[PDB]
Design a protein around this ligand. Sequence first.
Ligand SMILES: Oc1ccc(/C=C/c2cc(O)cc(O)c2)cc1
Ligand SMILES: [Yb+3]
Ligand SMILES: [Zn+2]
Length: 607
Amino acid sequence: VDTCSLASPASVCRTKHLHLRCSVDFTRRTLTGTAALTVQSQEDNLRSLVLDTKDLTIEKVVINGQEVKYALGERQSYKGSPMEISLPIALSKNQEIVIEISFETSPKSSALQWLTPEQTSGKEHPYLFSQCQAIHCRAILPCQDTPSVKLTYTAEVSVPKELVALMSAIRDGETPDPEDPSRKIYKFIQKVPIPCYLIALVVGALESRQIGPRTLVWSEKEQVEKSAYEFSETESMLKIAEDLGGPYVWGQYDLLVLPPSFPYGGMENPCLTFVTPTLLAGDKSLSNVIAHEISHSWTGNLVTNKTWDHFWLNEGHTVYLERHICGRLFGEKFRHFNALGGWGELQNSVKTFGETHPFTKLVVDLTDIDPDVAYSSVPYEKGFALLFYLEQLLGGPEIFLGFLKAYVEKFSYKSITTDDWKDFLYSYFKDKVDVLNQVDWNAWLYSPGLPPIKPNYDMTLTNACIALSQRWITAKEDDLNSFNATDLKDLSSHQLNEFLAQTLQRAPLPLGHIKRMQEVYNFNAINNSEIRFRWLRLCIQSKWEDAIPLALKMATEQGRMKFTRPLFKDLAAFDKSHDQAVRTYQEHKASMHPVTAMLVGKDLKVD
Ligand SMILES: Oc1ccc(/C=C/c2cc(O)cc(O)c2)cc1
Ligand SMILES: [Yb+3]
Ligand SMILES: [Zn+2]
């Protein structure tokens, strides 16, 4: 059972296909049109079914040429309102019908962000983007809003002729709109069955440049050149992902670089990965996020978590694969560097939540929890830590990668639970079931806090970061003169980032140490978003007032929640910046991404 969904379960009926015809109305900030659902009954004598909606206005429902009865139940908070449809003729098991729902979204759709022209790069045209994961697809169209159901889809999207629509699908043509010469209809086909959270739409003033044999980058004109360079490694990452996971089944691997309020670093929308523009560091240093998104083309998009309680299946497997691609490209010691850094991110998250907090369990029961509220690094990093532990336990990377490849072949086009995965792990490693029985399964999967066992990590690239950080923490005033620009001489951006992650773990530092750090390292000049983020955090937490406007500016000039949430929270806990933080949030709130707005508001304990 999917406790985040109010729709009929897959055991009652299944959506096989969606045909979406819609029009994007920037004047009303609505999307209007029809969702035609091809539904297969899984039950005998089926007379009604229930769908997910959230702030949709239903016009009518039509089956076999005629309108039918439907009722909207009461809203259940973030789950929205269930829509019961009365079927005109009872269905037999495996019978299929098409149900056509005429609907319109609200301007307040939690799946959508509408941007004015001044919120974009070109300043001439508005922009729309979606973000359905986890349970916002219902806020766009009526559906069984559960990753336990996979469907194909086709879509026809009408938009102002001077704009471009793109979706998570192969582009299937464009023509003028017959019903309105000021408009174009773009057509789309997704031939691979996907959970509905993978449904994606963007409409904006978009251009494209080709960067590999099966990759275009898309963005507003003024981002194209930079994006083309930043992601040039994409094809070669793809080939390595294909070697590890098996064939890329989706045809195209395009990239869309979004405006800065996109809430995530990336979203693995099939055929068209959405990325944050905070990735555009100038040096390709943040390309693990492409590897991450690429890896989802197997782990998540091919084998899918059955409910959001099993989200670690998606995330931990993708992080595991992400780190193998980066290890191939840049060496096994880099894989261990990033693995150990992820363990540190896990320490931070368990420390922030508290070591007995339910959101620190690998598998969580999301029954009355908004997935957006529960979201964090835990499923990523505790997930990854589990697989890195099993890897070392069961014979090393080459052996565990054979399991990952087999696990993907086994569960392609399906949705699975943690037990499905563990049963399969036991089948695959039949000859190592004694070794498997040494694992504390209950603790790893179901207990809060840090895992019961820590993997073994090569420290080679980490040591210089730890050494430098310890110099700064143990320094007294008479030691600050000895710090120098040359200290950073032999550190990559990655190591500079880890240096700051380490120091931030012991924050606050004395204010004089942080002022000195800016004197000798000029971290204020670094535009790498990861580095700048943790530097500004270290500053605000060490109570440097000069950093207030720098932190406020980063918090609001981009909306990647990874950065935006902890910057506002740090700004709010700093007494000197508190009132300004709360005030800046209130000013920007109405033009923020609706989910980021919600979560920052809760973080600040405002409204
Ligand atoms: O966009 C989103 C996508 C996925 C989710 C899932 C969150 C979640 C967090 C956990 O600690 C455990 C878990 O099983 C699930 C939330 C938002
Ligand atoms: Yb001294
Ligand atoms: Zn992911």
